Amino acid sequence: YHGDSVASLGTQPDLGSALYQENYKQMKALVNQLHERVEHIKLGGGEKARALHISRGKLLPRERIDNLIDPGSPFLELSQFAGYQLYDNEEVPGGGIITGIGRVSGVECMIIANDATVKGGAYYPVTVKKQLRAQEIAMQNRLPCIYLVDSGGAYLPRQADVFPDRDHFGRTFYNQAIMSSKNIAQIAVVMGSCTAGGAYVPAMADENIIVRKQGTIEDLGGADLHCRKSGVSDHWALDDHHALHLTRKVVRNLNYQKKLDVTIEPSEEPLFPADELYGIVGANLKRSFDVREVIARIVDGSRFTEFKAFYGDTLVTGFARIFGYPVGIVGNNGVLFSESAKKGTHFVQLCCQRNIPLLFLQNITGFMVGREYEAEGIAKDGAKMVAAVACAQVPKITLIIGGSYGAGNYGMCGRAYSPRFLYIWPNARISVMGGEQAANVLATITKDQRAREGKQFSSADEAALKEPIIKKFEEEGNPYYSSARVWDDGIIDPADTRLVLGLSFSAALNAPIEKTDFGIFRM
Amino acid sequence: YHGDSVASLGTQPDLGSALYQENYKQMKALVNQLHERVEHIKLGGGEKARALHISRGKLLPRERIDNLIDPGSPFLELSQFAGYQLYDNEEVPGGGIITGIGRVSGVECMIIANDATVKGGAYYPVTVKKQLRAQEIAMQNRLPCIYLVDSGGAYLPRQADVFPDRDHFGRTFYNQAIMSSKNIAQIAVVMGSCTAGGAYVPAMADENIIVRKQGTIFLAGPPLVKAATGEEVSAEDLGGADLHCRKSGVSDHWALDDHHALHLTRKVVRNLNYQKKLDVTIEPSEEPLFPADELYGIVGANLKRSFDVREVIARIVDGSRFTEFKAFYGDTLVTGFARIFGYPVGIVGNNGVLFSESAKKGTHFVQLCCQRNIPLLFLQNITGFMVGREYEAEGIAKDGAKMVAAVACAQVPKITLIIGGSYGAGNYGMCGRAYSPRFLYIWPNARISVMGGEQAANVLATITKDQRAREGKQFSSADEAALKEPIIKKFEEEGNPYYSSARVWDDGIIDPADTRLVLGLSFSAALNAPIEKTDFGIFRM
Amino acid sequence: YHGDSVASLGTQPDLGSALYQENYKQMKALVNQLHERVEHIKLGGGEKARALHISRGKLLPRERIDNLIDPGSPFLELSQFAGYQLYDNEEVPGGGIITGIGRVSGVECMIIANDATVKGGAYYPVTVKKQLRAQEIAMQNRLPCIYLVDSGGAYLPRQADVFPDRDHFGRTFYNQAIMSSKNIAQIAVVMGSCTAGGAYVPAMADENIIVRKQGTIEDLGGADLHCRKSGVSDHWALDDHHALHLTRKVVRNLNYQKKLDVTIEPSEEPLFPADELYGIVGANLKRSFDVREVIARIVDGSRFTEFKAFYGDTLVTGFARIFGYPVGIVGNNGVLFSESAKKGTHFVQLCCQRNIPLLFLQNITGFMVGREYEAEGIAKDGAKMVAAVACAQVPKITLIIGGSYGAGNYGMCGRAYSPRFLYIWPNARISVMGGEQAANVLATITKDQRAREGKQFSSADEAALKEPIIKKFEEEGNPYYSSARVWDDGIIDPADTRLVLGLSFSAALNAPIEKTDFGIFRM
Amino acid sequence: YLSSVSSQETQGGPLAPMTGTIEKVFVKAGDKVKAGDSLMVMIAMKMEHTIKSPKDGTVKKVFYREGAQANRHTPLVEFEEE
Amino acid sequence: LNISYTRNMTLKDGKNNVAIAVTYNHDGSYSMQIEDKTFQVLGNLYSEGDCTYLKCSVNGVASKAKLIILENTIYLFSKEGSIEIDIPVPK
Numbered sequence A, C: 001y002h003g004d005s006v007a008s009l010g011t012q013p014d015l016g017s018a019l020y021q022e023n024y025k026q027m028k029a030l031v032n033q034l035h036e037r038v039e040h041i042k043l044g045g046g047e048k049a050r051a052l053h054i055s056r057g058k059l060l061p062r063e064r065i066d067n068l069i070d071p072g073s074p075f076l077e078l079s080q081f082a083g084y085q086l087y088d089n090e091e092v093p094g095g096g097i098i099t100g101i102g103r104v105s106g107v108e109c110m111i112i113a114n115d116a117t118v119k120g121g122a123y124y125p126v127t128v129k130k131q132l133r134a135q136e137i138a139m140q141n142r143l144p145c146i147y148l149v150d151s152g153g154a155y156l157p158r159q160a161d162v163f164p165d166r167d168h169f170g171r172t173f174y175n176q177a178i179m180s181s182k183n184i185a186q187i188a189v190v191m192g193s194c195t196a197g198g199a200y201v202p203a204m205a206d207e208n209i210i211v212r213k214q215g216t217i218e219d220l221g222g223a224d225l226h227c228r229k230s231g232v233s234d235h236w237a238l239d240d241h242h243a244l245h246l247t248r249k250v251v252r253n254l255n256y257q258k259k260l261d262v263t264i265e266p267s268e269e270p271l272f273p274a275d276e277l278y279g280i281v282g283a284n285l286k287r288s289f290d291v292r293e294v295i296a297r298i299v300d301g302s303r304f305t306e307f308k309a310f311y312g313d314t315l316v317t318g319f320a321r322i323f324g325y326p327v328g329i330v331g332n333n334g335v336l337f338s339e340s341a342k343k344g345t346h347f348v349q350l351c352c353q354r355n356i357p358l359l360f361l362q363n364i365t366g367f368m369v370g371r372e373y374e375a376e377g378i379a380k381d382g383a384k385m386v387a388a389v390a391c392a393q394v395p396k397i398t399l400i401i402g403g404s405y406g407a408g409n410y411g412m413c414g415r416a417y418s419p420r421f422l423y424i425w426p427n428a429r430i431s432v433m434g435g436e437q438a439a440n441v442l443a444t445i446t447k448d449q450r451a452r453e454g455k456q457f458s459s460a461d462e463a464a465l466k467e468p469i470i471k472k473f474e475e476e477g478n479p480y481y482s483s484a485r486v487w488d489d490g491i492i493d494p495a496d497t498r499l500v501l502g503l504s505f506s507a508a509l510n511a512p513i514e515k516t517d518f519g520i521f522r523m
Numbered sequence B: 001y002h003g004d005s006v007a008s009l010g011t012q013p014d015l016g017s018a019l020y021q022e023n024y025k026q027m028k029a030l031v032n033q034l035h036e037r038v039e040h041i042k043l044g045g046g047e048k049a050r051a052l053h054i055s056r057g058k059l060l061p062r063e064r065i066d067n068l069i070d071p072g073s074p075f076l077e078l079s080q081f082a083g084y085q086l087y088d089n090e091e092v093p094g095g096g097i098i099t100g101i102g103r104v105s106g107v108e109c110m111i112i113a114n115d116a117t118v119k120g121g122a123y124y125p126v127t128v129k130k131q132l133r134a135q136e137i138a139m140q141n142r143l144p145c146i147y148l149v150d151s152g153g154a155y156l157p158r159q160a161d162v163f164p165d166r167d168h169f170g171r172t173f174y175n176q177a178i179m180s181s182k183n184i185a186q187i188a189v190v191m192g193s194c195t196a197g198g199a200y201v202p203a204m205a206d207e208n209i210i211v212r213k214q215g216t217i218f219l220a221g222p223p224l225v226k227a228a229t230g231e232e233v234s235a236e237d238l239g240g241a242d243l244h245c246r247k248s249g250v251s252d253h254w255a256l257d258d259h260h261a262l263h264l265t266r267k268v269v270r271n272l273n274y275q276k277k278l279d280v281t282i283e284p285s286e287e288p289l290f291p292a293d294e295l296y297g298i299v300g301a302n303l304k305r306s307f308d309v310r311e312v313i314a315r316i317v318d319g320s321r322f323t324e325f326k327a328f329y330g331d332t333l334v335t336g337f338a339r340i341f342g343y344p345v346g347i348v349g350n351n352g353v354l355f356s357e358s359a360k361k362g363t364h365f366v367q368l369c370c371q372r373n374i375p376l377l378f379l380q381n382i383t384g385f386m387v388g389r390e391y392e393a394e395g396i397a398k399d400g401a402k403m404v405a406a407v408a409c410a411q412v413p414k415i416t417l418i419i420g421g422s423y424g425a426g427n428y429g430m431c432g433r434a435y436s437p438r439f440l441y442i443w444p445n446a447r448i449s450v451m452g453g454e455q456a457a458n459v460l461a462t463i464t465k466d467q468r469a470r471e472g473k474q475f476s477s478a479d480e481a482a483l484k485e486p487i488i489k490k491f492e493e494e495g496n497p498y499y500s501s502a503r504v505w506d507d508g509i510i511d512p513a514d515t516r517l518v519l520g521l522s523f524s525a526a527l528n529a530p531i532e533k534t535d536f537g538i539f540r541m
Numbered sequence D: 001y002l003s004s005v006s007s008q009e010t011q012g013g014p015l016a017p018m019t020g021t022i023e024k025v026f027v028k029a030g031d032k033v034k035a036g037d038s039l040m041v042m043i044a045m046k047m048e049h050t051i052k053s054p055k056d057g058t059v060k061k062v063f064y065r066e067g068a069q070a071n072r073h074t075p076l077v078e079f080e081e082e
Numbered sequence E: 001l002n003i004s005y006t007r008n009m010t011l012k013d014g015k016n017n018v019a020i021a022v023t024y025n026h027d028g029s030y031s032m033q034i035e036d037k038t039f040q041v042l043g044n045l046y047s048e049g050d051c052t053y054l055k056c057s058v059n060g061v062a063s064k065a066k067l068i069i070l071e072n073t074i075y076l077f078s079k080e081g082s083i084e085i086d087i088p089v090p091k
Ligand SMILES: O=CCCCC[C@@H]1SC[C@@H]2NC(=O)N[C@@H]21
Pocket: B224, B227, B228, B229, C335, C365, C366, C367, C368, C369, C436, C437, C440
């Protein structure tokens, strides 16, 4: 019986209020800035490179993906901003590689395609990291991997950051071998030249497809030599369109059917518009908002069962459903306290026991600072949550909707704690500590330095100390700085939060949920 | 292909026959007696206690259950007669606790509610046993436990029978901890005062709900704080306070009133992320081909007369269809396959004195059901004295054990129904209480004891006739009934169904017309747990 | 490397001190009282019954055990005081049954022998409970069961407390069937008459032995009929001595070898005499002593590593070794506090993680009582320990060296929490609460009853209330009252504590230690 | 509980979110306010919080004035009993 | 536990059966009663070369003898003399 009427979250914001008007205007500008930058990245190398690419009879990398996935199906692209201003004088749109999750023959797959128009498809250090991140996502969720191979090899000027280390180019083949041993299909489509390590990708794949003349692993390589004499090729394709058609057939023969471990209920849209998040949140991290408002606009029917509502109120935990999937939501609503950490630790155990996916909404401002709090083991309480979150085996997704500073990042399932996905809003900031705190802390150390030493240190000497620090933390905490390197899986428009979460959780459910084993809880 | 026509059990009884008329009249009186006694137990403590309970804004315990379970769903109450005349001068309707299985948010759950109108909700020795039985049922069938806590603590005058032992009050928390470790949800709703030692029940639960004004949770009561530290505190301030909900954090949900708390409980169960899965094959249900109330005339209340157990089977199984196994071998025992509400069941029922062939036939049948993972139903009607057992009754000893050993090791769900006598080792072979059947029910005409009352009387009439014949002082016939009459009275009193049910030896006394419904509900609940593989011991060939 | 020098526990008591002299004198009297009462129980039914028993050519029940076990091996008898003054006018020495653990053919076995000299071997309600307790011990530790069957059937006058219920006589055969299915050998030796349910015991056993003329299951039963015609008998014995010799051969063919899951170190005697425990502890529960003194006199070399010594000092936890086995010791040193419960919960997790047996020393006086303590969730903290102790799967042994009242009993692994063994010292007291507290509590309720009602209630009216309560709790909390019923496994002399623990832990190690699964820790 | 009259009953009065200076007061001693009407603004560790009206009840009294330091969980406004 | 173990042993000297009640003391000694006389016995086994020797003290009197147990006969060799004691053979 599911006919019980229940309460719903959310309230109607005051659209006429000046705060709402200002917050909407600021957030809208950030979203528009995000959109137009992606449009530029969409063009890859440029008109001359794109014209040359088409002149050889090859499809553009993004057109290949469009033809590969099922007609009209959504495509979840990851790390669109990798390599954004990462290198001083070189522009590398998207890192030279396009990765994402789409549906092929009704099966969710990870698609990894080299962008030959960007530096001829050479592998920059960020390119390796982006690919390795994609492989990690595919393995953790048991998603078949499809490699649209068109590459020019490693970028020699930066070889030391590509070849040698464990997380360098060599790890790519290691991941392929491991996934194959686990029956996670590895499919390679040679749609261009692949040299040196590149030739290993088709060789290490379970099934392999090569284009008639474009692909090379012509006399030295070529489809004919490998297809008919070397035997490296499993399928022979006339052109790019033919190869993509063959790939769809290969996936259809995987003999795989998705099975769900969780209970399912009919989907319902939230009771409030998503674009209202612009006014509610804004771009000023100093102002505070009720995280429940964000929740009310992404969960099915804006229905939410809060757990321990009046205890540790700076943290919000409860049960909801997104697109029918059950989810346990943990979101910051203020400074973390001992009660908040205990409340979170209790909640995480509940979700792990029932095998319920966890969603984290990071908007942190730090931990409570005080002599009494330390005497009561706030560190001991904060550690309880870091330790429960780490050991949890349910799928975990993290969304940074605000600041992410210090140990608060770890407790809320930061990148170091292997969340299945990590996304950030365009207004987010991340660093070891807030820019102001680092400035103020230094303003104590050197005020002390010269007060204790005895040479006076004046107020103008203070901003010759504080202004460079604040600039550095603002620049390095910017979402684009974080996303240019692969620290998150993408910057997403707040209006798209519900859709992105729905796609992400759906992909994460391809793998069975394991039992959680915890360490010692330091009581 | 399931289109084959098959034979059906049962025959039309002779309604005009004098035996049927007498048997119906006697059984009907027993059922009417059972009904009116339950009506009295339904009232709990009484009008004054009930009026006081409502005056505090609290719902009556049975109204709480009605609002908790799904609208219109049946509720299987257990051990309604616990504490019936158990204590000399104290009336404890239902033992001070109400336990049963009902559907909450579409999930079968075990509901354990204290009856605050009965002795203020104090825990009598039978109250602990009834609760422990409910927890055992929930664990064996993986049923979530919901505790509607309104209690006054242990009954001090009888503390030695409540506190110390393994099956005493302490075991209640042990069961909660074990079920939680197995992912069997434990939900506590504090709808009234939680006394010293009952404060653990809200704390030991996975999720907890407390009422704003009525609920109080404190390990030490305001009086103990006053005695130990000379401090005076109101009950609300000491525990069940906004302190417990917020400052102490013991409370997971905060409820305005009883109705709000029950609504919250339904939401909590809906978030368990549980879905029932069946290990057995299912077929469409069919009603029996004969009326159930005819069981009154067929069975009666005279245990000396005998009836064909097949008649009972014909009136409870789907379509009165029954496939008998080894029909002509060991005919005193009936075994076969049937279906109740679509579930497959293997039925074992007594049709006379147990023989070596009967025990062997039963042992063979039990192995078959365990191999195919088929639930087992036992219909106990053990025969007592009269002509008696085989005079040697020696061969029977070797054969009887095999069946006791097969029945004990069987891992399929087992349900026992005592429709007649239950005496001696025949009880063990037919899955008595000692052999952990998932449920055990008795009809109002049943009798249970170590042996039949007459056999104990006759046996003593041999020992003391011998005592004085061998000693040499003569012992006359009138001296015989000064020996026999007290024995027969004792066994009649202690073998009565109410005596057995007042203590928790069975899970309830049920009207024969309700047998099919009770079995259907019981088997449905028992299927919430996966059926395990059966490992047998050595079969002494 | 194990050559490190370490500190040792214990201090030399002041033998000249008046307190030590008084405590030694009082405890010695209790031990002497315990010894002489056992001597009387040793005689069973009496001279006339014993003379009749021997006149039939049968051995006395205790002589049978002496001949069954290995020469000179110790025998750990259990529940010697079962049935002590339990029934108003009937004397049932030892409950009519002798149970204990001894070594047969080098294998530790549970021996259950009916005492035919006591009421002809009839089964009283306590007799069933004692046997069921023995079977529970054998199953939990995988000890083979040997039944020396000489019984007269159930005691009809008390049939309702023997036959019907789950823990009644029927459960005896259920236990035999379950142990057999687990490869825990069940051996029955029919050395006398067995009738009705008694005949099932030889039939339900894996291997069976019957004496030539004494045993009956003569024409109706008898060894010859069952041995040669019925086939119920597996071995045929001339007399009691022959049957015991056959039993030893049967055990030798079990193809069993003991394996230890724990690390072992050479044994060492404690550095202090055990008899000093008389002076240290005494018989006055109101006085307090340092539990470390008790520990120093039972552990190998008086070596003890204390855990969280300065936190929650009312509870003592640490690691030691008894006869080479590793043990984690938890003992009360005052009233339980929130810190003490947390400290215990942390310690129990450590032992379970490392698979270390746990020993509990119960000397409780209650929980801390106060408004502040309840506000800080003392109940929540106390529950943490009840829940950890219950789920622990390492072998657990409990020793009550003092009071055992209220919920403190549960937290310290009371009988309800299935410790492998539970022993009590002759000075112990157990009840729902202390006798004085029940008296004082009632002295508040009825002082209130008449102050609030308005009829005055005088001080002499107070002791017409208090004296009967104190007498009842003193009588029902007495060790003999607790031991007469099977609430503990025996009353032991403090000087024998180390030996009893060594034998008990050795037996408990016959079963492999399982992994511990905990519930939700309510943080 | 569904009516949301309960939301008013859940807390009698607004409390201070944290220990911080009161930067703004928007309510006079007797003022009619509706749920969501800002009553006070407080800065704690350089973080601005605006207190909002829990109920539509008129304000009985104000416990703090501008520039006052209010401790965590201390009542800020008194509302007339209805 | 709480009692002392007394063992009934039988030994044959020539044609005479001797009943010995041996009590195992806590200290490790033995109290043996033969007919109406009680003896306090304590000793140990030590090896010289290939011969096992029994060092015992009976009622405070200490002596050494060579011990050999072959078949069902106990051989005790002492400078006072040699004694053979027969262990009864179960039927
Ligand atoms: O004994 C008489 C009543 C007052 C003292 C009892 C103390 S208070 C501390 C401890 N906790 C209890 O529950 N009882 C004792």
